[PDB]
Design a protein around this ligand. Structure first.
Ligand SMILES: CN(C)C(=O)c1cccc(-c2cccc(-n3ncc(C(=O)O)c3C(F)(F)F)n2)c1
Ligand SMILES: [Cl-]
Length: 289
């Protein structure tokens, strides 16, 4: 059995929560807290281990952007620090290729990063790679066919409809077709042969719209919209379905979890997080024992 893990997030301040939702039975487990509260982080899994990457501790006692990489082992229910990134990256995106973690973009104070770096678990080492063509914070990241895509975000001045693709064997970024919608702090994931971008902020409104990029056709197509408008949502795939978790709708820090069924093109309410929050990190791995 596999669980959807949600790490960190934001309500009033950055959160240390780690909780795991089991689609098979509707249940939530609270697991070991993050060592450091963080919002605007990303989650990913490599070799059954859950990693929490970047973010920011927004707290009454000060605000600190995170360069941290921390590893959670479901077998032990324990967090362990890994090597830190070259730079703090709040509102980061991440993707895994070939057992390596790419950390993309994000902010450090007023610095909006185009830089990108790659973590090798076997070596506990980060190394910089080619930077993106654009500065992107609140960037959506997905991996399809061992290529890494960076989608939308905020460049320090404008929210972006643009997207680009990183070709590892050439260490090179190239623009792809722009989305039909400006999206920053969207949820971005892969399903089948498509990159999905769900929600985000366009500069004026939180979005419910959802569109997908087909790598073979190089075009974006809208699918059915989510039931909730949301920016700073978490997103993941579990058994061929997209799940979106939390976010901010302009009014409420959402506890809503929705899932998308591509065959019926419908979104439905699935469960509620134990408390409303935005800016979480999400990934899927094995049950704790
Ligand atoms: C209302 N608040 C501030 C929160 O709910 C919140 C709190 C902490 C972290 C984030 C977050 C997480 C991931 C991406 C983003 N970005 N990154 C860029 C933009 C943009 O405006 O362009 C956004 C946002 F806020 F929409 F979603 N934010 C949002
Ligand atoms: Cl923030």
């Amino acid at each position: 059995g596999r669980l959807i893990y949600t790490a960190g997030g934001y309500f009033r301040q950055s959160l240390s929560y780690l909780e795991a939702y089991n689609p098979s039975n509707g249940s939530w487990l609270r697991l070991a807290d993050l060592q450091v509260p963080r919002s605007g982080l990303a989650g990913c899994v490599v070799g059954g281990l859950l990693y929490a990457v970047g973010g920011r501790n927004n707290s009454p006692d000060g605000n600190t952007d995170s360069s941290a990489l921390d590893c959670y082992n479901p077998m032990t229910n324990q967090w362990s620090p890994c090597a830190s990134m070259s730079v703090p990256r709040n509102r980061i995106g991440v993707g895994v290729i070939d057992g390596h973690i790419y950390a993309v973009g994000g902010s450090h104070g007023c610095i909006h990063h185009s830089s990108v770096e790659r973590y090798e678990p076997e070596r506990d080492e980060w190394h910089l790679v080619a930077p993106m063509l654009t500065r992107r914070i609140g960037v959506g990241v997905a991996v399809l066919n061992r290529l890494l895509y960076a989608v939308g975000g905020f460049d320090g001045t404008n929210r972006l409809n643009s997207a680009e693709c990183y070709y590892p064997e050439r260490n090179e970024w190239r623009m792809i077709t722009p989305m039909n919608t400006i999206r920053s702090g969207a949820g971005v994931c892969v399903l089948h042969n498509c990159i999905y971008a769900a929600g985000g902020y366009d500069g004026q409104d939180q979005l419910n719209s959802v569109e997908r990029y087909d790598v073979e056709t190089e075009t974006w197509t809208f699918v059915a919209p989510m039931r909730h408008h949301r920016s700073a949502l978490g997103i993941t795939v579990h058994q061929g379905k997209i799940y979106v978790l939390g976010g901010y709708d302009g009014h409420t820090f959402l506890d809503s979890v929705e899932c998308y069924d591509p065959d019926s093109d419908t979104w439905s309410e699935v469960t509620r997080m134990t408390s409303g929050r935005s800016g979480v990190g999400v990934a899927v791995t094995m049950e704790p024992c």
